[PDB]
Amino acid sequence: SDKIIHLTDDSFDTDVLKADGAILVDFWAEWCGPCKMIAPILDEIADEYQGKLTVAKLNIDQNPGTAPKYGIRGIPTLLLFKNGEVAATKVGALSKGQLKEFLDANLA
């Protein structure tokens, strides 16, 4: 999480819903192995897209309410919030290339 924003339900309002720019919100949980697998990828992405994409992580174990709120199907769940509006989303993990493509395609 070297360059990742750890969100909470409480902070979600101001940090995501009242955001400006592109925020990639990765919903995760300690037990959800693949979240840990993508974590370094998300950090690399965060570094690569510094100032272009705000990479964020949201711990659902601590913040369950977010899952129902965003009809989360299963974690890891990446929600790409442009100014509080979900521009795109991804259920499950991604490879670095595909993730870069996905993000780039949204950022445009």
Swiss-Prot record:
The keyword Electron transport applies. Residues 1-108 form the Thioredoxin domain. One of its GO terms (cellular component) is cytosol. Transmembrane segments: none annotated. The record marks 26 as: Deprotonates C-terminal active site Cys. Monomer. Interacts with bacteriophage T3 DNA polymerase. Belongs to the thioredoxin family. This is Thioredoxin 1. It comes from Escherichia coli (strain K12).
